[PDB]
Design an enzyme around this catalytic site. Structure first.
Site, short mmCIF file in Angstrom:
data_model
loop_
_atom_site.label_atom_id
_atom_site.label_comp_id
_atom_site.label_asym_id
_atom_site.label_seq_id
_atom_site.Cartn_x
_atom_site.Cartn_y
_atom_site.Cartn_z
N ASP A 239 25.74 -18.18 153.88
CA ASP A 239 27.02 -17.57 153.85
C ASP A 239 27.32 -17.02 155.20
O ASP A 239 27.07 -17.66 156.20
CB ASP A 239 27.06 -16.51 152.74
CG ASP A 239 28.42 -16.08 152.25
OD1 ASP A 239 29.08 -16.71 151.39
OD2 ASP A 239 28.74 -15.01 152.82
N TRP A 240 27.85 -15.80 155.20
CA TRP A 240 28.27 -15.14 156.40
C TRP A 240 27.12 -14.91 157.37
O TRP A 240 27.33 -14.75 158.58
CB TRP A 240 29.16 -13.88 156.23
CG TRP A 240 30.66 -14.16 156.12
CD1 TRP A 240 31.38 -14.26 154.99
CD2 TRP A 240 31.56 -14.33 157.21
NE1 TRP A 240 32.73 -14.50 155.36
CE2 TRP A 240 32.82 -14.54 156.67
CE3 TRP A 240 31.41 -14.34 158.61
CZ2 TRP A 240 33.97 -14.75 157.45
CZ3 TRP A 240 32.57 -14.56 159.38
CH2 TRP A 240 33.79 -14.75 158.83
N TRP B 78 36.45 -16.57 144.09
CA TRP B 78 35.63 -15.63 144.85
C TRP B 78 36.42 -14.60 145.64
O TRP B 78 36.24 -13.37 145.50
CB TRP B 78 34.70 -16.49 145.73
CG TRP B 78 34.02 -15.85 146.89
CD1 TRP B 78 34.53 -15.57 148.11
CD2 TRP B 78 32.62 -15.47 146.94
NE1 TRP B 78 33.55 -15.03 148.92
CE2 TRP B 78 32.36 -14.97 148.22
CE3 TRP B 78 31.55 -15.56 146.02
CZ2 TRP B 78 31.07 -14.52 148.55
CZ3 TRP B 78 30.27 -15.12 146.37
CH2 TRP B 78 30.04 -14.59 147.64
N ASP C 96 26.40 -24.29 143.52
CA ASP C 96 27.39 -23.55 144.27
C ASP C 96 28.74 -24.25 144.33
O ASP C 96 28.75 -25.41 144.72
CB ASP C 96 26.87 -23.24 145.69
CG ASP C 96 27.71 -22.28 146.46
OD1 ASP C 96 28.61 -21.60 145.95
OD2 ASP C 96 27.41 -22.19 147.68
N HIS D 266 25.26 -19.93 144.80
CA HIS D 266 25.50 -19.57 146.19
C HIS D 266 24.42 -18.68 146.80
O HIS D 266 24.12 -18.78 147.97
CB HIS D 266 26.83 -18.82 146.26
CG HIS D 266 27.35 -18.50 147.61
ND1 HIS D 266 27.74 -19.50 148.47
CD2 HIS D 266 27.61 -17.31 148.20
CE1 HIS D 266 28.23 -18.90 149.56
NE2 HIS D 266 28.14 -17.58 149.43
CL LIG Z 1 33.51 -14.27 152.11
#
Ligand SMILES: [Cl-]
Length: 310
Positions: free
Chosen positions: A124-125, A175, A260, A289
């Site tokens: 992710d980030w 999300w 995911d 995820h």
């Molecule tokens: Cl996000």
């Protein structure tokens, strides 16, 4: 300067499986009077450092099942919490949080601790940001463990890294809606939705850092930045692609959480092509995820793969 608040320490009193001691820095350059929290586990003199970057809307608590495996292998593990998250300080205005603001903190942290022989662990980030770090100082990076992540490039150069924003409705659209719309955002409820296998206890550890919405400005801004990519993010992410395709010569290990809806296989196979030397991915069928909730298997396999070349 940057108006920020700090989570009361008692909020983390009852954390499940989080026996790691805090370490703080409140003197980073560019981040005046902002205290950052990070875990420093294993041998502090190890040659190998695992830098574990978390994403939206979690903290270093996410790496809690991987940390011990990496440390028992003889590595030092660094797991910082970004500002607005976990035990670090949280700026109060969403406008303070930018791509570069979080990126520059990572470069500041790395220089400050003088990390070398880094094995980048992203998702992710942690990955949007962390995949752009190596080109800045290639010599400190030696390996990468990449879970569901990609680069925040423009739609034309990589449509795979932009498509998921709009389709499907129950993916990134859902999300972002769950995160930026509620005026009363419950992160424990959000996590149990997005990571169905979490126990009650673990879900509450993800809500632990935010007593009320006034603490969640960083949580709010991240999805918005996936949606609205500023020029600097685009430029930097675009340039990282070139670094991975032509300059990267380290070892890589990829793991995909197959359930995911956000950054699964239609995003990860294309990512796998841009990363020079990336081997076949380790497809984890039951993971969504948050691949790290099936983290022990990922840490053990990656170390396995890494040993069969070192
Ligand atoms: Cl996000």
């Amino acid at each position: 300067m940057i108006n920020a608040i700090r989570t009361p320490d008692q909020r983390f009193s009852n954390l499940d499986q989080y026996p790691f001691s805090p370490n703080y820095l409140d003197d980073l350059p560019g981040y005046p009077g902002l205290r950052a929290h990070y875990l420093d586990e294993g041998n502090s003199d190890a040659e190998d450092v695992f830098l574990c970057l978390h994403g939206e809307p979690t903290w270093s608590y996410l790496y809690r099942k991987m940390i011990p495996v990496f440390a028992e292998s003889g590595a030092r593990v660094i797991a910082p919490d970004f500002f607005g998250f976990g035990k670090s300080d949280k700026p109060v205005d969403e406008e303070d949080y930018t791509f570069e603001f979080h990126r520059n903190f990572l470069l500041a942290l790395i220089e400050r601790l003088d990390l070398r022989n880094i094995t980048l662990v992203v998702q992710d980030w942690g990955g949007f940001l962390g995949l752009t770090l190596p080109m800045a100082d290639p010599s400190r990076f030696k390996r990468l463990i990449i879970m569901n992540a990609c680069l925040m490039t423009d739609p034309v150069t990589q449509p795979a890294f932009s498509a998921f924003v709009t389709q499907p409705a129950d993916g990134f659209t859902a999300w972002k809606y769950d995160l930026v719309t509620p005026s009363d955002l419950r992160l424990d409820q959000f996590m149990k939705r997005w990571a169905p296998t979490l126990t009650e206890a673990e879900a509450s550890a993800y809500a632990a850092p935010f007593p009320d919405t006034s603490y969640q400005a960083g949580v709010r801004k991240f999805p918005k930045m996936v949606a609205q990519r500023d020029q600097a993010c685009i430029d930097i992410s675009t340039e990282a692609i070139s670094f991975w395709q032509n300059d990267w010569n380290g070892q890589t290990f990829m793991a995909i959480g197959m359930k995911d809806k956000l950054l699964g296989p239609d995003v990860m196979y294309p990512m796998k092509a841009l990363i020079n030397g990336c081997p076949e991915p380790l497809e984890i069928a039951d993971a969504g995820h948050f691949v790290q909730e099936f983290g022990e298997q990922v840490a053990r396999e990656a170390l396995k793969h890494f040993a069969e070349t070192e």
